Design a binder for these strands. Structure first.
Ligand SMILES: [Mn+2]
Length: 101
DNA sequence: TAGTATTACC
């Protein structure tokens, strides 16, 4: 049930929610990336994220760390694929660690 | 899994 690797989307993040995530300790993660997306024409600003935790984490622990309003899923793709997907719009909020095999 | 949404990796 608890799982090491999760993606997340957070739609219309507020400055508070961005700070919560910004302020996460980097010791929590083997790899973590968060991109700001959805800022272009007629479209929803959101965080596009991926977390590879040091330890496996339950669904509700992940929501505690990242925020109540996040949509989260067990990651099916590799760290590298997620790194590319969450970097695709060119405005990264944070990235720490390195992608893992 | 719940929450926010059409954004969400393979
Ligand atoms: Mn996106």
């Amino acid at each position: 049930q608890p799982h090491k690797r999760w993606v997340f989307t957070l739609n219309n993040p507020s400055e508070d929610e961005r700070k919560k995530i910004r302020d996460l300790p980097i010791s929590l993660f083997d790899y973590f990336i968060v991109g700001e997306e959805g800022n272009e024409e007629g479209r929803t600003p959101h965080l596009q994220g991926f977390a590879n935790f040091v330890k496996k984490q339950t669904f509700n622990k992940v929501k505690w760390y990242l925020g109540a309003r996040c949509h989260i899923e067990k990651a099916k793709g590799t760290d590298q694929q997620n790194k590319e997907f969450c970097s695709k719009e060119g405005n990264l909020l944070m990235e720490c660690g390195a992608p893992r095999s």
